[PDB]
Amino acid sequence: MPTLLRVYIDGPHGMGKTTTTQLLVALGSRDDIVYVPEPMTYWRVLGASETIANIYTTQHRLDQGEISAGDAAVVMTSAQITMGMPYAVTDAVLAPHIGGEAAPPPALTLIFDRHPIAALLCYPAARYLMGSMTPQAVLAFVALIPPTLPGTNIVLGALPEDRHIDRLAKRDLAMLAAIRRVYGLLANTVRYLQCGGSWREDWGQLSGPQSNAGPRPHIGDTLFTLFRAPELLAPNGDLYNVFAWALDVLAKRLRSMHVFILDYDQSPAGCRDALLQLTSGMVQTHVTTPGSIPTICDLARTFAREMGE
Amino acid sequence: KMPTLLRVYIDGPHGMGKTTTTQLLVALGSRDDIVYVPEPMTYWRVLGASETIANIYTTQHRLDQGEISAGDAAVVMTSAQITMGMPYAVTDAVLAPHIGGEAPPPALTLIFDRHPIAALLCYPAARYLMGSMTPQAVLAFVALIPPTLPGTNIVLGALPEDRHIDRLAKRQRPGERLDLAMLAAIRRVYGLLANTVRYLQCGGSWREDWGQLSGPRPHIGDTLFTLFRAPELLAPNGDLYNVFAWALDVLAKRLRSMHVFILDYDQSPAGCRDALLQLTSGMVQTHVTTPGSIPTICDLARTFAREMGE
Numbered sequence: 001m002p003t004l005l006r007v008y009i010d011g012p013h014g015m016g017k018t019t020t021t022q023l024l025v026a027l028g029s030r031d032d033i034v035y036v037p038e039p040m041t042y043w044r045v046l047g048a049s050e051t052i053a054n055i056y057t058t059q060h061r062l063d064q065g066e067i068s069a070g071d072a073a074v075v076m077t078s079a080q081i082t083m084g085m086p087y088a089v090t091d092a093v094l095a096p097h098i099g100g101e102a103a104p105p106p107a108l109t110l111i112f113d114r115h116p117i118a119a120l121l122c123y124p125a126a127r128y129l130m131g132s133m134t135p136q137a138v139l140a141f142v143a144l145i146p147p148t149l150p151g152t153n154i155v156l157g158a159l160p161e162d163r164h165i166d167r168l169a170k171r172d173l174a175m176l177a178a179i180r181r182v183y184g185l186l187a188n189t190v191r192y193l194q195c196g197g198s199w200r201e202d203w204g205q206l207s208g209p210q211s212n213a214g215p216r217p218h219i220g221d222t223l224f225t226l227f228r229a230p231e232l233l234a235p236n237g238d239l240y241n242v243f244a245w246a247l248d249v250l251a252k253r254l255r256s257m258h259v260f261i262l263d264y265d266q267s268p269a270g271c272r273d274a275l276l277q278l279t280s281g282m283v284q285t286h287v288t289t290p291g292s293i294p295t296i297c298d299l300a301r302t303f304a305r306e307m308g309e
Numbered sequence: 310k311m312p313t314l315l316r317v318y319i320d321g322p323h324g325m326g327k328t329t330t331t332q333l334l335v336a337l338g339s340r341d342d343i344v345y346v347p348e349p350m351t352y353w354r355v356l357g358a359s360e361t362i363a364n365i366y367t368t369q370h371r372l373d374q375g376e377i378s379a380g381d382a383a384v385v386m387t388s389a390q391i392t393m394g395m396p397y398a399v400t401d402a403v404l405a406p407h408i409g410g411e412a413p414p415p416a417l418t419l420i421f422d423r424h425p426i427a428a429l430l431c432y433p434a435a436r437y438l439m440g441s442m443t444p445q446a447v448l449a450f451v452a453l454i455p456p457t458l459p460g461t462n463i464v465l466g467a468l469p470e471d472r473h474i475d476r477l478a479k480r481q482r483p484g485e486r487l488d489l490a491m492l493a494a495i496r497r498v499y500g501l502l503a504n505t506v507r508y509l510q511c512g513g514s515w516r517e518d519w520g521q522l523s524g525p526r527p528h529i530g531d532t533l534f535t536l537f538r539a540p541e542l543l544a545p546n547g548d549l550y551n552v553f554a555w556a557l558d559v560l561a562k563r564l565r566s567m568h569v570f571i572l573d574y575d576q577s578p579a580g581c582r583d584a585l586l587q588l589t590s591g592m593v594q595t596h597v598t599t600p601g602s603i604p605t606i607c608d609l610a611r612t613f614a615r616e617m618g619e
């Protein structure tokens with residue numbers, strides 16, 4: 001079978017993900033690489049009206065005291081469903097085309113602006129840290145994360161907080177801190193799981209980044225530490241089983257991902273070349289049918305045309 | 310080489326049976342070869358949030374009275390449905406790796422109170438019909454319906470509307486309001502669901518028949534696809550956006566491989582129990598994937614019941 005390379009560019013907004021991605025795509029002949037872009041049209045028009053604006057307005061109103069936490073939570077939960085929809089459908093229709101992990105060049109490279117976990121895990125977790133989502137809803141989103149397809153390469157981003165702030169300022173610091181922390185925790189969680197970490201065994205070590213390499217992180221430095229919330233704990237002090245099962249699901253979904261960290265602290269071309277070097281260690285898969293490749297290409301471009309800026 | 314499992318999802322519009330029927334299902338679970346995963350009412354009232362059912366029925370009542378906007382209702386209904394479906398979704402996710410291919414009596418019969426589609430498709434669709442959920446949010450839920458595993462046996466109920474109204478009036482849930490418009494919406498959605506599975510299983514192609522919504526198997530107008538001719542989902546030229554069309558492809562793939570069985574509730578609780586048992590004769594069993602799968606499943610089910618069963 002022909003092989004496919006799927007790369008999800010993810011991590012906090014405002015680091016240079018989109019520019020870097022576009023530059024990499026530009027290196028290729030038109031047909032050997034396809035970009036599945038940020039579905040901004042869905043978010044602004046098709047799925048609802050101006051979802052990004054509604055999200056930031058709601059946080060501000062919460063921080064202002066103009067609305068309750070309960071009010072903010074219903075809006076954020078509802079908005080995240082809208083945010084995530086294009087990711088989730090794309091995954092669902094891609095799935096039957098993806099074979100086992102397969103190296104000679106891929107017939108097709110597919111590059112995504114974000115993975116489903118952005119909308120179903122990372123942004124909800126950060127909203128939770130900001131007090132505008134309940135941890136129960138975060139775990140409900142976790143339970144709905146689709147089964148992790150073979151060859152799921154995710155690229156996260158590193159950038160000094162000062163440079164990140166400036167970059168964002170030139171073009172909500174608590175939210176920026178929150179999302180940066182969540183993605184750092186994510187990277188550690190994947191490493192923890194691939195080093196054989198069992199959250200149930202280490203749960204009691206709780207009380208108070210990089211994948212790809214390094215030693216096993218402490219559970220206190222992974223996403224698992226976020227869910228010690230009193231909302232989730234029974235009178236005896238343990239997690240209710242329903243929430244423990246969501247953490248089992250979190251573990252299963254993350255542990256088979258291939259995570260890479262891109263240093264965005266350089267020029268656009270430098271980021272591009274760094275991303276290119278990173279793809280040399282990424283996992284390809286076979287496809288299901290010979291016609292899978294043109295189908296995937298059509299799917300991505302259709303997506304791009306309809307939901308892209 | 311692995312033992313066999315029978316999964317049975319008791320679903321359909323709520324309020325058709327009796328708490329006597331339920332007690333028999335609990336009593337049915339007394340056997341060593343059967344476990345009954347009950348309604349996670351404790352999750353909905355306390356664990357996942359506070360009085361979710363009440364929230365739902367109050368929100369619709371106030372939309373109907375004009376005390377809140379449709380938009381306000383929709384954000385509440387959407388987030389409440391997330392809470393409602395969470396126990397179904399985690400359960401399915403943890404059970405999924407234990408399920409093998411299709412497979413004489415089964416080693417274990419697992420009987421669930423509802424399938425994830427109740428909270429990710431059917432109730433959201435009914436609320437769309439009640440004007441309290443956007444059709445975009447419904448398709449977002451559809452996009453997250455877990456893959457349909459082998460041996461997905463779903464039992465839906467038949468009962469005359471008058472008798473259903475009667476039974477429902479006598480067993481309202483905490484915070485529930487007796488809404489005849491909602492009863493009609495939910496009954497229609499489940500009727501459309503049943504037709505949809507047939508349409509699909511008889512080779513129906515929604516993309517091919519789509520034009521007939523504006524012009525042997527059910528007519529597409531008698532399936533769930535008719536709901537998604539909603540104008541919110543259409544371009545200025547009337548075409549469905551691809552993103553929603555893809556969600557309908559997912560809907561078709563999820564529904565086609567479900568095995569649907571209709572339980573006549575117009576009888577006694579004991580009758581209903583016997584009817585359900587016999588129905589299992591035509592249900593599809595699967596293998597489990599590991600020797601330790603059976604006892605793991607049992608543990609999950611028992612733990613679920615004890616923690617979230619009322």
Ligand SMILES: Cc1c(C=C(CO)CO)n(C)c(=O)[nH]c1=O
Nearest residue numbers: 012013052055083084118119123
């Ligand atoms: C994906 C995602 C985002 C991020 C973007 C939209 O501004 C682009 O990075 N944001 C900001 C959010 O609040 N929720 C989300 O699910």
Ligand SMILES: Cc1c(C=C(CO)CO)n(C)c(=O)[nH]c1=O
Nearest residue numbers: 323348365393394427428432482
């Ligand atoms: C499953 C489900 C129900 C049904 C039940 C809860 O009362 C009955 O089991 N209801 C009433 C609802 O509003 N949303 C749902 O997702």
